[model samples]
Target chain A: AVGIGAVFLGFLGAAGSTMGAASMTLTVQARQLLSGIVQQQSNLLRAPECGIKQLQARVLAVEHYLKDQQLLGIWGCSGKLICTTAVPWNATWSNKTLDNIWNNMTWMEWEKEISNYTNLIYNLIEESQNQQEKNETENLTLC
Target chain B: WVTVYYGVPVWKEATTTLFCASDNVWATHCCVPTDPSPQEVVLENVTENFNMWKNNMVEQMHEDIISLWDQSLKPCVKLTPLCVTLNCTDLGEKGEIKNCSFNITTSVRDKMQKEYATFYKLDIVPIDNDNNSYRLINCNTSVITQACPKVSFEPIPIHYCAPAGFAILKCNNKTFNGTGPCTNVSTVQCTHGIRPVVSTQLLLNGSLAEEEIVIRSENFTDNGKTIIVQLNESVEINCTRPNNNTRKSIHIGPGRAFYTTGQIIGNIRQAHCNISRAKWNNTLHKIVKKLREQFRNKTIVFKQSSGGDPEIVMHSFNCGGEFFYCNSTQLFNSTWYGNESSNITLPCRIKQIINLWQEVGKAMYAPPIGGQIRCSSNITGLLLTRDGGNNNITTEIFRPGGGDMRDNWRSELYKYKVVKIEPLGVAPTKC
Candidate 1:
């Protein structure tokens, strides 16, 4: 009970301190998770952090960032050098998608959720490198 | 096949893995079982139907995946419609690195996070290692997913670990076949039939007497035949005799005919409860909040469903014709159940019952009925929706009476009313 109280308060603190876009980003889902937490916490939670490693704030930070990039066209060749990036834990998959998939997973148990980052990046980059090489050679020959 | 009983924990949460000051209800460890017989499992969804869906999915993505890369080089990688994904390729099994580690500049992280796969880290490639460039390396590469025969379980027998009590058998009502994959699926709509009905007989030494414990929200008594006590945070024998010269030590049984000293309490395996306040209030707040959302402005319509005599409420003043109607919020929020000691709204018993029902995901199914509700007077049962907004409950409501009157009412009118609860708008209310 004490432990639940603490997390409940912890969530409140997280919410209060970082009401940020996380609040607006998820709209209803954020409320669901929040209420569920609050239900577990209830009158038991006495105060708030407006502090700490909060769950909602973090999920929001990641989701917003993802949505931004999704619109930015990261899959393209718009290779700008300086961009904003957060940790893996802040990612949406870490929050919504992660828990819901199998509910919970032990990272590696998630595969890197792989084709392994190595597999995809490796193939993409390697194939791109080969394609770039071919393009270069063809251009030279035509010239 | 082994026989196992299904029950709901009085104070426990099966899905939550969090801890809090209010969650300490686990200490009570009581389970109220629901079914008389073991619940059966029904698996559905034909394989051809599932396979066709899967086959269409990959093909459909054909146009979509292309759209994602229109801003870049000719789409380098592609997903096959007939073939699909596997967890890993045989090459990754050989142990060489086969994943991508993004080496993009700072400005590029935005694109990565937007389209869904952002949480994943692709740092398997080498960049500027010494200058925090990279430390990882891969030796081999393999396929992402394997293509296999388009087959499915047709009718997956999906493993079902018989639940404690309708803890959401996953709490769904999707039909497997129109002919009905089931016949008798037992369930109880909350707000009604949620409380157990039990009556106790008095026992003096080894012989049985007509002694009974009429537990109401707290306490009750009459000309020495019926007495009431609050189930309380902690309910125990207490070992005392204030009014009568009977019942020394009571041994409880599910129904009648069990004995103990001069104190004849029929049933309750044994209790070691206390300091039940702290956690209960925590649960109560949540329970209350949930009700407001469900019943906020909804109208509760109670009509006669079964039983004989008119329900107590039917005989009340604020009711409409033929059926008893009231604002859901107004009705539940009022101190409805009480004795001559002035009426009290909801007390520990209701909370306790709510606690039990909510423990099983606020299931809409009845727990087995054979135990006495140790909360308030003459209310042998409670039948309410898990939430007040979407459903209605059929509870036994009465204002005046107990003992013979209460007992008589119970036997004849247990399942009397049928209440349908859904929602509302507002205007000054009437009971």
Candidate 2:
């Protein structure tokens, strides 16, 4: 009986220590999780602007090339069909060139980057919206 | 301090001993109660409560597993990657077509260029054979050169033949001076204006002959012989063909040479002068007039259709001012057209516009066999501006060849700068 009683007491002591340790660990973990989520939320809000800027930059780069390479200097003297006269900076030229560049760019790369940025923005908006909605719903349910 | 349950307190009396009975002997035992602290009791209860919660969580997990197993084997089992990989990933299995991935790569693009593309890969998905479902029988991709070589034409020989006979006639008892029976010969042969092989010949007969005959001539007459022919005075004339030696003899030589006295036979007056030559000249003019009218009336229509929004009345004017961006509903004029304010609206029915544009565009592209070509909406017209500059646009068309497996379907791809959008005017409002 005494031996059995000693074993039982030892188990009780171990249980107490485990409970104490778990409480301390869980509090710290919850705090870290909340902090990480807040940081991600801030980053998500600014992602769309970044993606749009990248697109504008790429488009401008191609336009600058068209102007400098084909339009300037003695390149037009050849009277070639693809001279500056043919590819003037008209509305049709601008729209067509923009569409072509958009189509030819690596969709997997561009789409992944742009979509990721958009999705981040979307997630952030969704998160904030959902949080507000949940708060409202809680209030309503309480009432 | 606490009362002992079976023994005396340990610190107060170390040497104290309590009697206890054992081994089937009856004996008296002292009892004491020891109480735990409130905080310890609370801790113990809370720990037990947490343990019960943990066990409940474990039980819930086992319940979920049991439910999942029951669901997995049901008739319409919800599928996951694991289930699909295990049962359906084998290619021969039924309903396993979804496991196939149409992973088209650059290598496939190259194969398509080589005319060895496998069209069956596009049909692996379960698609109903509806009109929307594109069934490609033999898909052969070929690149054709659209530019036509410059054409050169050879000039054909033109031949003219001189008319036969000179004449003096006695009509209405008057004599008109004319060559009695003079033969003027023209020895030129006409050929087709352009031909690979050309042959020229002058007809021995007076009829102009070649691919066709054109006679440039002048007519003249003397003002007498009308009275002599009308008075029934005999006028004898003879015509002899120089090459064939064919001869003919006539009394009055058919009509008046000049507008003087001539033999009359049913409003036909024969002059003693140059009547036969005048009659022949009038007959030639009448035939030539009829031929010219037929040539002037001959027209050709080209047709175009597209998967995108259709344009109507692409040919009403020579130049459509500006390019319009197309939306699902309508075409919006971007800042491109010179007149920024003239935003025109079209008929709401897209089908009508599409049909009209397709027919018109096609007619412009290819004309009728013998029709006079009226400019509709031609690619050249649309692409080139008034300044004779091309609007940085190009077009390409692709079709599958019969030598390869897929010949039934022909594909044309036209790449053009969206230079301008023009609306159908009031003339075609209903269209």
Candidate 3:
């Protein structure tokens, strides 16, 4: 029984070796798969966060430009221009339409609309920059 | 004193015619008794008687001688002419008597006529009567053919002369014969040796108020010709001559009304007669016509009612991508917005702007911009618009430009809200 157990053990050892190797390989494979999935999920969350941080930087740059041009705090209503010291871009998104969207929408819908609102701010900053460029070009041409 | 005897007897002898008696008794015998012896002697005498007679004659011769001596001692008588009565008559009237006559008569004895002679001649003299000279017509008169004397005289008229320092005068139509110094008359026909013509007219603000004015001066008769008036003063004047029928008061100034008909000749000064009619008219009619001319040729735009709270309507015009709007009733808004638009005609826009300014320039009360009539564009700007409840509109402005951005443009300027009286109308899409 011992000899037979030894032959079987040899075979078991080879199989165990193979199985261990396979299991090791499988474990490795499983770990590789798990790591791959976790990595993919991490990448999914981190990409937009990175984009949002970049958008915030651009928005601040446009605000600073308007302020330097002495046009940022200006508004118009009753046939007159009113100037203010408060920055319009720095104001909280507490508009009536925005508040309504926050209070009554699902998380996904809120997210989508929030992104769109952010994009609108981005567009405003882009247009302001374009106009400043045009103005500079005209000034240069006139001089 | 002596005693005397009455009848004592004494012896007497008587002689008869041819005898002588003796006183002796013996004589009785007649010469013979006692003398007987003597008788004898007588007888002898008788014889001788003749011789006795011769002795008696011698005694008679002695008595005759005594008578002759007494007759030789007597005086002798004579006769002369004499006047017994005298008579005369008064002298005839004046020169009727020249010489006087007289008569005389006398009686004398014839024996005394040779011793006395009778002759006479009369003389007459003149005298005075009643302050005149006259002569008597009769003088001396004698007995035979007597004549009376007479007197004479002449007649004349009387006259008187006036004294010094007096004159003949006529006063109140009565003549005085050489009276006194001239005084007291009702009217003086001439004053100071000359007659003056005086007249006047009443004027107020260069227009006549009366036809004529009569002036009275002070003369000797209390009625004369000159008048005195003060400059810039009012005087009451009468308008009629010879009688004061109408009276009016007027102010005296530089005008012809204060002058007289002729040149002044006494101590009075000349008057200034140049007054401007236009200046007087300006003072008299200043209230109505001139006040109306200031508001001419101006346009006025009215605010329309839209059945709501009173609010102004704003018209908007698009210039390229920008918009310009203005208040309808505000001239300041018109200038600001009209200048901002590039598409409107320049001349038309300027005319419209000027008209709008005139319309609100003198209005009693218009909506004031920032407490001023007009707003300056360089100092004005639009601030913003706010949402209003139920279509109400709210607006704000930025006042004053050209300053630090952080200091001046920090907040809203003036905020105001209005309820719309009318819709804003359809805004123009483009220009």
Candidate 4:
């Protein structure tokens, strides 16, 4: 349980960092778009080195989390399981291909996309916390 | 009335030697036995087949020569196929090497063809100075020249032995006629079968009552069997009572099973099966030992076939006569098993590539995502192609990596009511 908690937090931390960096890029891209500044690139490409570093960290953290999840699913839980949820673990697309796409997007468009994903992550965390709380409360009540 | 044949292993040089059946008349070639019955002696080849003594040697046979040679010759080599080198350069009487062509008495040849009806297989085993001893080995079975004929030729590649490696044998053709020589004969060889790593059984309701152990992925030999799990980092087994009570449970530490660790470690196998306070490392040893013991005692039966009930059942949901169905499809090595044609029912309309991903993206909430949402449940199983009624499904959609990216990317929401539903494999519940 401690191990699972550790991995879960690791995933969240990486995701949070990406969301912050992506927000800044989005802001820059949006300004360029509104000003009619014909630029060769947008916020995704102009993303700071720190943002890329965060992505790398996020990728490694997710890889570890996915591996543990895969093990848990096989040993602890039983049901129909698909790997689609672990898309971040996809080295071929998420690492290289998706990163390139992010690099090519304009600042305004990038911000829109990043903001959308950020909101999605927040909602996911909220729901997860609620579920965990509910589970703990139910266990206590039963005891 | 007969001359005795003395099969002797004659050592030549330091490592090479030969096993030859020698007597007053002629000598026999050495080779490995192919038949399971030890009684069946497989000669080198029918071409090397010859009589031990000339006609009427039975009446005044040299009994002393046979006994003397037999007593002197020791069966030092193991009976199985061994590496050997045949000099073939000599024929002998009483330990003297002599170069001579083998002469088969016509009567003996006739008896072999008429009564035995056996083909000869031959191999030449060589002994080297590296290992000083006679070796029982030979080359490919010499071709049977004639049903009744005698011939001999100088041996080429005189120095030879069985190549140290895995042997693959096969028989391609056979002929059984009581007439002319076999015109088309093919090579026949031997093969082996794969053995499972472990085969054992676990008894229900025993000392191993509440046991939890991680069955590693590497331990599984085939890919058809999969362990389904939600997104988690490690597999955990909690031994529960029948009444949903928490009992002693074993947790698999991080790392792949079987591959990373030599064996499983857990508490269930402790001396007393008390897992609560059992030391973690010791717990693993106990678990593995218990499992091994239980396996040996026939307490559990481990089979290669599938186990447990199907988690997902095929079901069809109908609405107003329009039906949308989903079904499970299994393909062995990418080819659907023809034998399962009647067992599995194909779906009526599988969610198309374009529509499927679009629904998935919508479920994922591509815009303004607040939190993580699983996008898996929306993806449907394969749809069956209908015959004679607009069932033109392209191979492109079904291929593992060929689906179109644009059409498959869907984020729009569908406001209309769904008409029908079919449950495919097990429908997953939200985490």
Candidate 5:
């Protein structure tokens, strides 16, 4: 009778240990998944920022070319003179109509959208990190 | 019976009729005896009058020719402006001016086919002395057509400015835009007696509990959340709370400097304020002037073929070398040369030479292999040589095929020739 009771106590102890190990493994897997989500969010945010930077550079190049045209007098055919005057840096005419449309609306909207994404990703990273720290503390107590 | 004074008195008594061969008898031999007649005097007067009238008429014709040339022909030539030199002379016999001839040499710009012409109107008929009616004796003109050469022009540097915002930003030469709070407001504010003063305060623990130990300034107010101070005024505030104690001094006036947060509720100030001035070069201006002068004298010719007739030719002496030449030729050939159906062959050779000359002028000005640097340097050398003390410099400009290149080729071979020098040594001195 004594031997049977000892065996039963040992079995209960082994089962409890197995359950704890399984729970810890699940917590660790969840944390790893959260970290991956954070990394993907960061990458998504960076891609548009890079695209915007490239677009900005292209816009600058176009602006420079237009300005150059304005400075160099256009020698059109007789009766067809174009851009006779030097455009001032502060004048609206210097900004090509197409460029204005792109910069003022399209680029700005893109920038806003990307910035919002960046902010959301940052919040997600913070939340994930906080959850991970809570889970690590809980694991330490359990151990 | 009649008695004669001389020798035998042969004077017949019978009267005889006077036999006059013609109406006017200069002299008459009478058997009845008579005095000399005045018929010879009348004949001499008539001959003299006829000679005088003939001479006078010839002289008048000569005068008319000269006058017509000076008043009509000369002005007509001058109207074209292309005729640089015109010379007229009287081609008459003896002292009578019967005909006049002229020679005209025009500039390359004159598109006319005829460069020279001789016109003569017979004044008096060809006779032993004078005869015939007035008529056009002869008239001919020399036509010249020049073939214009095509030339290429150097493109001028183009100037341009970037868009306003970009340009302004570039001029500032800043890497990034301004950031942080209060960016919309000017860093410095000006006021007249500080009428519309503004301020801000900090919140700690969300309570309006304050223990101020010291307060300095006559015109000043603090309401925990906002503060108003006078211009040029200095304010000292000492606030002591249960947990914290702070002492601060703030200045309110024009030229005062302050700091701010990223969120500002006001107008946004420009990061940079400046105007960029375009660059100009005096050297470039002088160079352009020289270029203009070089091309100013050039002229272009246009030729059009007329089916069977001679082609019509037109010339344009303009600064726009190729543009004017091409347009003028297209218009002239289509309108005149294409319509005429004659066997006359136009002076295409002369036109060809004219075109060659235009090309030569352009070549002299166009930048070569090394571009403007080499072109300008060559021009400078030429100008210096021109202005140097060598007043006898004679330039015999010729086309490429005028002569052998060796005749003008200067040899720099002597510069590369090496010379050997013998060493000199003193004889060994005896000890």
Candidate 6:
């Protein structure tokens, strides 16, 4: 999180007149942008609420599947007594796709981008709020 | 042609077409197709968990809808944009206004109505982006071809299992040898048995028959264990032309029994180690009636039989050897001895064993259970071939062990106990 998202989102409470138009857009885009790194455990002991929590959620799902044997898989043709149940995603043979996506998480590049976007969102919200507040005061004086 | 439209719009005057109050775009509140009356939406919600699944769900549905839109909806709907900004010749067809050289009020209203169309005015999510002052067109059903991957019948009949044995095969009439499964007795190998061919054709679910089969398999001597099936990577349409009545299915696995094992053939009672028999006929008049009148061209292998039949030696003739000569059974090179065990097991039926030898190609279990397998056939002695199929059962050497081999049904229970049969083949052992 850099503890960054909670602090920045808290700033939304402090800086809020209402939902800033850009901040809502930033929230959706930020959720999408953090996918590759936030979902991987080796990506840096990611911050508690930010990257780390999402990775924990995915790991928990895998554990659930492994214990329950609800995962899907195919089998070899021989009648030998090999495995009879579906293997968990990680246990699958010759699979490179999940590893490529989850294992190679470059955390530094990710934190920098979100940190930049979060600051820009807060600053833009403050400017827009100040303009509205100044207009309200001007209207009161005129009345 | 450019101005053609399928369905007319309700009214030319434009109003707010759609709205998105932050998220959840699929509901009627967010994007209404068309409503005769205006909407006043007042949605209320209590504070919920921050981990709302609606965001991801929205993206998934958006992708699905757009994919369907592209497949069946987008092709038929064409947009022809109209411009009402008379003086600016920047876009659209140039036209003289009927009321507007200076009838500026209506022209301004018309241009504003065009501006009235919008979807966040952004490309972040797909919308009916082309629907601005345009007509909608309905597409044809012929575009959706019934191209299912359903097969009408199986390429091969399932449930065929045969014992390992020599097969008289031909590559035929070609330089290879012959193509079909030939049954003429052969003394020497006619063709290489290493590449025995297995071929098949599949009929599409609703399509009529096509010319020839294309799927085939060929492999080594161990085809009894390791058969290799080969198919072209491309979809085998049989005929490249699309059929009129064929329906589309995504796959063909349902029609084929890829896991089924057996020597599949067109005939009913034919398989490895299985014999189809007729009544043992010695009368010349009855023999001619059975052979000439009833069957002439039917593919069959006939063996004479009665209840307690003996191993009648086959007739051997002095014919030339290039193609085939008279076939007579050869004696087993080695003799067999059996001793009694405390745990006695009855031998397999003598009738069943004789029927086994009736099979033209004699193959039996070698390294048989407890060191010996019992078999009998009609020949000078009895024919024997050590093949590795049919009987793959094994037992441990605990002094004397009995095999749990049973006939077709468990009704005929038999076990091989360690006990002496005849002293040294004085007579054949019987159950």
lDDT of 4 by residue, B1-431 (tens): 00100111100111111111111112222122222321111111111111111111121112322332232222211111111232233221211111111111222333321110100011113355532122222212211111000211111111011111111111111211111222221111121111111001111111111124322111122322221111111112112111111112111122211001111223211001111222322232333333333223222111122322111122122111111222222210122211222222232221101111122211100011111111111111111111122223311111111111111111000000011000011111122
For candidate 5, the TM-score of chain A alone versus the native chain A is 0.20
Q: Write the per-residue lDDT of candidate 5 for residues A68-117, one digit (tens) a residue.
A: 33322221111211111111122221223433332333221222333334
Model 2 spans with C-alpha error above 4 angstroms: A1-116, A140-143, B1-431
Q: Candidate 3, residue B373: CA error in Å?
A: 14
lDDT of 3: 0.19
Estimate, for each residue in B110-210, the C-alpha lDDT of model 6 and write its tens digit. 33221221101110111234322221111111121111112111111111110011111111111111122322211111111111001111111111112
Best-matching candidate per lDDT: 1
Q: Model 3, range B1-431, lDDT digits (tens) per residue?
A: 00111111111111111111121111221121111111100000000001111222223222322222122212111101212121223322321212222231213222222111111111123343422222221212211111000100000010010011111111221221112322221111111100000011111111111212111111212212111111122222111111111211111212201110111123221111222334322221221121112212222111221222111123221111111222212211211111121211111000000111112221111010111011111111111111113122222111111111111111110000011011010110111
Q: Give the local distance difference test score of model 4.
A: 0.20
Please provide TM-scores, in order, for all candidate models, with all chains considered together.
Answer: 0.17, 0.11, 0.08, 0.12, 0.10, 0.11
Give each model's whole-structure lDDT. Answer: 0.21, 0.19, 0.19, 0.20, 0.19, 0.18
Candidate 3 regions off by >4 Å?
A: A1-143, B1-311, B315-376, B388-431
lDDT of 4 by residue, A57-114 (tens): 3454345345434532432222322221311222221223444433443222323334
Best of the two (3, 6) by DockQ: 6
Off by over 4 Å in 4: A1-93, A96-143, B1-431
Q: Count the backbone clashes (under 3 Å) in each candidate.
A: 77, 55, 38, 60, 24, 25
**What lDDT score is found at residue B360 in candidate 4?**
23
* DockQ for each numbered candidate: 0.01, 0.01, 0.00, 0.00, 0.00, 0.01
